[PDB]
Each structure stands twice: as C-alpha cells, then as structure tokens.
Amino acid sequence: VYVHPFNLFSSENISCEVIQSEEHKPLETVHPLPPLPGSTDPDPRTAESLKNLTQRTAVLAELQNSLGLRMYQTLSRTQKHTNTLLSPLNAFGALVTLYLGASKKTAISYQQLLGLNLESEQTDCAYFVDGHTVLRTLQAISAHVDESRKELRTLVWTFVNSDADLSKEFLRGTQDFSDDSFVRSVDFSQAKDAEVEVNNFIQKTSDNKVKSMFKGVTPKTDLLFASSVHFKGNWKTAFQPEATSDQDFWTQKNSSVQVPFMMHTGDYKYLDDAGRKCSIVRLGLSKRTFMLLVLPHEGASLQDIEKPLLTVIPTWLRHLKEKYLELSLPKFSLTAVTDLRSVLSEMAVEKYLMGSDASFRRMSSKENFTVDKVLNKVVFEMTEGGSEVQNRTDDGRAPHKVTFNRPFFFAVVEGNSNAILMLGKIINPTA
C-alpha cells in the first residue's frame, strides 16, 4: 500500500549525499565514558513531539514486522527442536541505533535490510533517513503498549573500550528508543574478567534471568551492545482458566512432558486453515495486546506450518471468525537471547552490517572501530494461570476442541499499530 516509507523519516528537504566524500565531516564524541566499576545509575535523561505519529507508527510496524518475521524464519530453521523467542521491536531498534554510527556506505546496507532505502540510479550519492525519527517512532509504539512500563519495559546497554570515544549521535540514539539506558567504558585487557563484570552489571541493572549475556569477549573488543524487552501479562485475566491440571505435552512423537495446562470454554476468534494444515487462535493478553497462536494439524510438522509466516499472517487475521471453542493451552513463559550477528550471518547480510565489509567511522574516532556483539534479551512473562475461575456455560452448545499439546508458534502483537513485539515457538513449555 503506502509507497516510499523513506519519506516519513527524512527531512522535507531531501538531498543525495555523497557516499565517499573527499573531505570527512567532524565527528562529535564523548570521552570519558562512565567506568563500569562504580556507576549503576541509569544514564541521565533530558522535547518536540512527532507530527505524523499515527502513520509513522503504522508504517514502521510493517517494516519491523517484515524484518522480524524474516529473522525469526531464519533463526527457527537453525533450531527446529528448541524453544525460540525473538523481538522484532528490539531487533529493529538495535539495528537503527547502530545505523547512527555507520559510515555512509555501510548505512546504505542497513537501510536496504530495513526497507527504508530510496533507490536512486546514481552511484556517488544516496538518501539517508533520520535515525532519531525512526527510533522515536519505535519508542512511541513501545510506550503506547503500557505507559507505566509494567506490561512492557525495555533497556539498552552499551559497553565501550575505555580507550575509545563514542559518538554523541549514537548516545542520543540509545535514548531515542529505550526506557532506560546504560553506556559505560570497560577495559577489556583482562577479557575473561571484563566479561564477568559486564554480565554482572547487566544482572545488577535489570534481572537474573540471563546471567551470562555475553560469551566470548576478547581483549580487542571495541563495543558490546545489548538490549532487553520484557513483556509481562497475567494468565488468570487473559485466559480466565476454568480448569487447570498437569497434562501431556508432546515435545516429540514419543516424548511426553507433564506440564500445567489451562482450559476455557468460550467464543474465540479462530480459523482452521485446512489447506495449510493449521489452526489459528486469537487470544487477548492485555488492553493493548493480543496473542496469535498457530497449531499444526495432528500429523503435520511445525516447521512446515511456519513456512508461509512471512506473508500469510494478514490473510489469517483477515479470515479469523468467532467459534465456540474448548481451548486447552499450556501455561508458559519464555526467555531467550537473540544473537543478532549470528542471525544476520545466517541471512548472509552480516558481512555488510557488522563484519569484514562494515565501517563504523561515525561511531568513534578510534581507527578500525568494530561492533563486536549485538544481543536482544527477550522475556515473555505471564503470571498465574494455575488457579481456577468460574464458568459461563452456554450449555446448549457443544464446543470445538482445540488443544495445544504439540509444538506451536505464537506471536504477541500490540493492537494500536499492529506491531509484533515478540514471536517464537514452544517445543517444551517447561524446558
């Protein structure tokens, strides 16, 4: 539909800037950065609101959804039999935040992956988005989910080689899209020790759900980047369980796991896609989000059901219809860490965004600056669900049984701009 998204995130006076200028523009940086040892307080925060917010957020939600589905499809294929969890929101935000430190040539590669490139047929110049406008629009989607920052909360970390300065444009980006940010210097000399301090810092701030965020720090690292998006709902109010007990969950055909289940009888937005051997269930999670549940037919493989996810979701939403269901769902919660470099490497685009072909000359004055690690800690937390609530029985209606006792795909979507906050699959709910 809407054509040329680039126009929503650039100045009104667009210009084809020279990719490789003979003269380099001065780079404004910050040094010293707060040492990691004794600074635990969030970075202090300091604006003119966005003018076309509704269209900018709806358009950016499409872009992040496309990227998210593409990255999920890649990730899942590499771990068919593992619980998976990825956040399009924080993946998009991570890349756009890094886009602010990229050389112009590398920045083009970021735009192309993100769907924000304006293709001129010229080779010496190109069109660049305002990353602050993109990040501030992404923050708008995040913030509108729950302004109190309980049902959804995000954090951004960056750890910089103490010998290096850091671009103020990048620092600004870490505040355009996070709810709280931490930018610290680290002496990576004693690398194994540096790695422990960093990971402990992340636990101190934030939670204990990921205790070794970063693995494989070397003495030569220049920048480590990690973000986290934490969704928190409540099974009791979202699912209204009428019955709860331990039941089988078949991780494989001859591999059972007894897990807490829930059951509810009530009208759901539902669709049996016979041709694709899939059953889709829509379930409300909060005031501003809903969950989308995809269960393969018995005898069909989840990997097969996940294959048209890049394009089929809108048709599935378009064709959902209320059906009286007896719906049984495992009580589940899931936390995972996305290694963006590894996922992008599977997609064959890493070399241009953080690898051998990437320049971050607008990130720092330090020569040959590298973005060594890029991580999203993604937490899907649901509370309760093991107790029981009362029953509104039609009585004169036989319900249609739908039981999520085999591996299934799920996605959590905010309903204002229809952005996918996180999506994944459950191989074993209590793994």
Write out the chain in H/E/C secondary structure: CCCCHHHHHCCCCCCCEECCCCCCCCCCEECCCCECCCCCCCCCCCCCCCCCHHHHHHHHHHHHHHHHHHHHHHHHHCCCCCCEEECHHHHHHHHHHHHCCCCHHHHHHHHHHHCCCCCCCCCCEECCCCHHHHHHHHHHHHHHHCCCCCCEEEEEEEEEECCCCEEHHHHHHHHHCCCCEEEEEECCCCHHHHHHHHHHHHHHCCCCCCCCCCCCCCCCCCEEEEEEEEEEEEHHHHHCCCEEEEEEEEEECCEEEEEEEEEEEEEEEEEEECCCCEEEEEEECCCCEEEEEEEECCCCCHHHHCCCHHHHHHHHHHCCEEEEEEEEEECCCEEEEEEHHHHHHHCCCHHHHCCCCCCCCCCCCCCCCCCCEEEEEEEEEEECCCCCCCCCCCCCCCCEEEECCCCEEEEEEECCCCEEEEEEEECCCCC
Q: Phi and psi at residue 377, in whole multiples of 5°?
A: -80, 120
Cα 238 from Cα 240, distance rounded (Å): 6
Name the one residue in this structure whose structure tokens are 């990971």: 199
**Nearest CA-CA partner of 6 in 124, 89, 107:** 107
The encoded tokens of residue 91 equal 């993946």
The experimental technique behind this entry is X-ray
Q: Is 240 left (phi over 0), alpha (psi -120 to 50) or beta?
A: left
Cα 350 from Cα 356, distance rounded (Å): 9
Question: What does each C-alpha distance from 72 to 116, 117, 228, 370 come to in angstroms?
Answer: 20, 22, 17, 25
Residue-range domains of the chain with CATH: 27-36+54-233+335-380 (3.30.497.10), 234-331+386-426 (2.30.39.10)
The encoded tokens of residue 343 equal 């996922």
- List beta partners, residue 223: 160
Cα 148 from Cα 290, distance rounded (Å): 18
Cα 16 from Cα 10, distance rounded (Å): 12
Residue 278: alpha-carbon gap to chain centroid: 25
Cα 1 from Cα 91, distance rounded (Å): 24
- The set of residues, in sequence order, having a beta carbon less than 8 Å from that of 22 and lying 6+ positions away, is none
**Nearest CA-CA partner of 230 in 93, 90, 136:** 90
Cα 140 from Cα 425, distance rounded (Å): 27
Cβ pair 316, 280 in contact under 8 A: yes
Instruction: Find the radius of gyration of the CA atoms of the chain.
Output: 23
